Structures are given as structure tokens and as C-alpha cells.
């Protein structure tokens, strides 16, 4: 038998209890990053390697700006939840 | 800046809402598996690779045995929550 909850993977744009940032002109931070990394390595890196680079990109190359100071100079870190039992590659 | 929540990794023995099984004479499933994998690959595999094999080892090699049918033939799958921004190796 196999656990009913096994082999799931949730790539969350932010950690529990926090906001998630989106640019009306460029799109959300998490998605921008995700697509950028996938375009370059989606075909040669493991899913966790990809999401870890995504985590690093969102955390480093992104800082908010808003008239409202409560939304100014804010950061973000994604959240990856894995129940995968094998390594995942999108090729061969 | 760096997000204050970045670079954290949680390795739970089970998924949210579920039980986590322990053997009185052998120890809990999650720890037995974790230790056996680290004893054999803690020095040559990336943290996510190690924990993924742990997920598989727990999901496959284990299945409960109890007098109470409600605890009979039960399964388990660990849960990894990563906010890490890089790959992790315990060496060099």
C-alpha cells in the first residue's frame, strides 16, 4: 500500500500568515521568478533545485514600493511543501 | 535586504492533521528512516535528496500493526517545508 497523501507537492508563493506581492504591470513576484527559472532550467534541473532557485530569486531581486508606508520596502520568501517520494525531472 | 523568514527548513514526520507512528521497541518510523538514510548518504546527498528518500522509505517500508482495527494497517508520509535559498550539503 501507498499513503493516500503521498506524492503531492505544493509550491506556495509565500509562507503561512503573510502577504504575497503582485505588480499590476509585471505580474506577481513568485510567478515572474517561476517562469524565468523554468524557461532557463525547467528541462535540466530537479523540481526542488528549481523551486529553491525560485526561492532565492524572489527573496533577493524583489523589494516593494508603495505610497502607503505599510506596503513600502517589503520582502517575500516562497514556501515549498513536499511529500514527493522520488526526484522529479521534466525530461527524457 | 533578506526576508526574515528565509533560509528555514522544517522536516515534519507527518502531514498536517494526521497521526505520526512510533514503535516502542524500534522507535518512530520517521526517525528510523532519517537515521538510516543519513548514516548512508548524509555526506554525499543534498538535503532535499536525503529527505525525499526518507519520505519514500517511510511511505513504503512501514505499515502499522495493532490490536485495535482502527490502528491496524496504517500508513504515513512525512512533510518537508523548505524556505531554503540554496542547496545544502553537509561537507567540504
Amino acid at each position: 500500500k501507498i499513503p493516500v497523501e503521498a506524492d503531492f507537492l505544493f509550491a506556495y508563493s509565500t509562507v503561512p500568515g503573510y502577504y504575497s506581492w503582485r505588480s499590476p504591470g509585471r505580474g506577481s513576484w513568485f510567478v515572474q521568478a517561476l517562469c524565468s527559472i523554468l524557461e532557463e532550467h525547467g528541462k535540466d534541473l530537479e523540481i526542488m533545485q528549481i523551486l529553491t532557485r525560485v526561492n532565492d530569486r524572489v527573496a533577493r531581486h524583489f523589494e516593494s514600493q508603495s505610497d502607503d508606508p505599510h506596503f513600502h520596502e517589503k520582502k517575500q520568501i516562497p514556501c515549498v511543501v513536499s511529500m514527493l517520494t522520488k526526484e522529479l525531472y521534466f525530461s527524457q | 535586504k533578506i526576508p526574515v523568514e528565509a533560509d528555514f527548513l522544517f522536516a515534519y514526520s507527518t502531514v498536517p492533521g494526521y497521526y505520526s507512528w512510533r514503535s516502542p521497541g524500534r522507535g518512530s518510523w520517521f526517525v528510523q528512516a532519517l537515521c538510516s538514510i543519513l548514516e548512508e548518504h548524509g555526506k554525499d546527498l543534498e538535503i532535499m535528496q536525503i529527505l525525499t528518500r526518507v519520505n519514500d522509505r517511510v511511505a513504503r517500508h512501514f505499515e502499522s500493526q495493532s490490536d485495535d482495527p482502527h490502528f491496524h494497517e496504517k500508513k504515513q508520509i512525512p512533510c518537508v517545508v523548505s524556505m531554503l535559498t540554496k542547496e545544502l550539503y553537509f561537507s567540504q
Partner: peptide, 5 residues
């Protein structure tokens, strides 16, 4: 290290 398919 070295990650490979």
C-alpha cells in the same frame, strides 16, 4: 557537489 539525472 554534483547533481545528475
Amino acid at each position: 557537489q554534483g547533481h545528475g539525472e
